[PDB]
Structure 1
Amino acid sequence: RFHSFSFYELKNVTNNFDERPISVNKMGEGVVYKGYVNNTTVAVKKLATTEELKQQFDQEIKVMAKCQHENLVELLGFSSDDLCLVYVYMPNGSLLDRLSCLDGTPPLSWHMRCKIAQGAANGINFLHENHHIHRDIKSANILLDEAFTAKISDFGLARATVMTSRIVGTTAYMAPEALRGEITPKSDIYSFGVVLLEIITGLPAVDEHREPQLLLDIKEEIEDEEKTIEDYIDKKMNDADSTSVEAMYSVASQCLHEKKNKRPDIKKVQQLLQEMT
């Protein structure tokens, strides 16, 4: 299974869990730190009720032990002697940050965006084939390696027509039934639909200083002929073509069906994204 790391080894390779940003070991905020084990760069997540957090720690390791795939983040180890999770470092960060060009990275081309959408769908397919529900599909949870290969991340909420008293996930990406407490892989499809809109538009899922505030509402604007998908295509690309953009939008629109049973399954989503290219 997985190797244990001494808390002190992790402390020592993250410069005593140096909370200062890399620019000034903090990569994100528990808190994620950049570490170095031998000649390998790693991501160290230091977890921050206490009982609930230990359950999330145990659950995540359990999901990672079972779910190994090219389009899923790989867990390298853990520490429980304070809780830490050690992952393969993704040098190109999240899809959210690449879409926003955070820290001055160049915009992603339409070509790269198509590969990332296909890769992300492949990762979700592996999860659904293996009877797992992610529960928090979003662009911040799609990481990018050295070749911009999409890697589904954050299995802290992952579960193996069921209800819950503890509604979890990210509101701007959640399916109506998920907001009501239902647990289903059909909700992961809906959230993926929002990610596809982020890829087409380059816009965040929610923006308080925007009309509409929620990205998913652009589907209604397009359906009611108030706007076109053309109007919303990210202007930070030079290689997008109407045919493939409309093909990705058709997939996003199908994923975003309000009625869970009318949405395509992940295998259909993969097929449609393959046909697009």
Structure 2
Amino acid sequence: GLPGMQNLKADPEELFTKLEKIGKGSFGEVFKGIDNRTQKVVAIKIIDLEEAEDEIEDIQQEITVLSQCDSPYVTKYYGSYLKDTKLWIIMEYLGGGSALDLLEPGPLDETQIATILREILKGLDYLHSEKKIHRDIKAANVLLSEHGEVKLADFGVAGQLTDTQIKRNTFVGTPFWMAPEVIKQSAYDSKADIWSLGITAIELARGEPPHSELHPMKVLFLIPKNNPPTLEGNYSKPLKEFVEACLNKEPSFRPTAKELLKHKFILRNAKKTSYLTELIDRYKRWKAE
């Protein structure tokens, strides 16, 4: 069973107007689309199932996790369709672009960094309260609405904790952002997301994560072996300490998302999310040259 699977009689090529590519998930490309009945814009991920084995259980896990989330901070899932051998996965469209996109015109200021981190933390707090772990937190997977709302996306490797399985040990994520215990495949939980958040904070401040210049295979030993990264450069002490709190090699020494929502860097610098429209406008003006 696949949650939200629609009548196999329904034709997604009829119900949706498929537009340009806007991204990609674990296996499928993601397209902007129009719901032909409502004219709302949606995001459509298309996976070829014929061209796919081992992938399908990963796809089912993703959609299962997504369908169980109901949060302003997590991309909505609307349902799935089959067209011949292709699965059409219909999801919330966010027109502002990813936080990573919004870095292309130039650096963020610390108000913007704190606001985006605060909203990410609201998303993580929600997930972790549901015993879910995202496991691929990075600026590319943090999306903005055209109104500046901030949401977590791409649940391609998201995981579920249960009372019979308190921790996980699967090697998943994007290497530069992965926690040391995940890389070493030790038992881990939501604290792994908190490490990835720290890397993302560096990414938001500097434009790239630590080790970004190296072959990803090198971080397989570097991250477990080296002292954790710190934020280097002219940034406020609270931001540097926010980063340090997240990036501790010992997971139990990392704060919870709930706790980080009250961190002085967040409280002193975060502002209304509507202000992030300036960042979205900046990216639009820049794109247009």
TM-score, normalized by length of structure 1? 0.76
| Alpha-carbon distance, 1:263 to partner | 1.0
What is the match of residue 285 of structure 2? none
What is the match of residue 114 of structure 2? 114
2:194 matches 1:189: yes
Root mean square deviation of aligned Cα: 3.0
What are the Cα deviations for residues 202-259 of structure 1, in whole angstroms up to 9, with x where unaligned? 234543279xx98x8896576xxxxx541xx5xxxxxxxxxxx321221111110011
**1:244-263 alignment, distance < 5 Å:** 245-263=236-254
Identity over the aligned pairs, expressed in percent? 28
What is the match of residue 201 of structure 1? 206
2:280 matches 1:276: no
8 A Cα contact 2:108 2:204, kept in partner: no
8 A Cα contact 1:34 1:42, kept in partner: yes
| Alpha-carbon distance, 1:77 to partner | 2.1
| Alpha-carbon distance, 1:12 to partner | 5.9
What is the match of residue 35 of structure 1? 33
| Alpha-carbon distance, 1:107 to partner | 5.4
| Alpha-carbon distance, 1:199 to partner | 1.6
What is the match of residue 85 of structure 1? 89
**1:61-80 alignment, distance < 5 Å:** 61-80=63-82
2:147 matches 1:142: no
2: distance between equivalents of 1:50 and 1:170? 21
2: distance between equivalents of 1:139 and 1:192? 9
Which amino acid in the other structure matches residue 188 of structure 1? D
Q: For the structure 1 residues 11 and 54, does the alpha-carbon distance in structure 2 shift closer, same or farther, using more than 3 Å as the test?
A: farther
TM-score, normalized by length of structure 2? 0.73
SS of 2:132's partner is: coil
8 A Cα contact 1:116 1:149, kept in partner: no
8 A Cα contact 1:96 1:140, kept in partner: yes
| Alpha-carbon distance, 1:56 to partner | 2.2
Which amino acid in the other structure matches residue 70 of structure 2? Q
2: distance between equivalents of 1:274 and 1:221? 18
What is the match of residue 96 of structure 1? 100
More relative contact order, 1 or 2 (CA 8 Å, 6+ apart) = 2
Alignment coverage as a number of residue pairs = 243
Which amino acid in the other structure matches residue 83 of structure 1? L
Which amino acid in the other structure matches residue 61 of structure 1? I
2: distance between equivalents of 1:125 and 1:270? 9
8 A Cα contact 1:4 1:77, kept in partner: yes
8 A Cα contact 1:10 1:35, kept in partner: no
Structure 1 residues not aligned, in runs of 5+: 16-24, 223-227, 234-244
What are the Cα deviations for residues 29-84 of structure 1, in whole angstroms up to 9, with x where unaligned? 42111111132111111125834322222222221222111111111221135222
8 A Cα contact 1:200 1:249, kept in partner: no
Q: For the structure 1 residues 66 and 202, does the alpha-carbon distance in structure 2 shift closer, same or farther, using more than 3 Å as the test?
A: same
Which amino acid in the other structure matches residue 213 of structure 2? E
Which amino acid in the other structure matches residue 135 of structure 1? R
Moved over 6 A (4+): 216-219
8 A Cα contact 1:196 1:249, kept in partner: no
Q: For the structure 1 residues 97 and 258, does the alpha-carbon distance in structure 2 shift closer, same or farther, using more than 3 Å as the test?
A: same
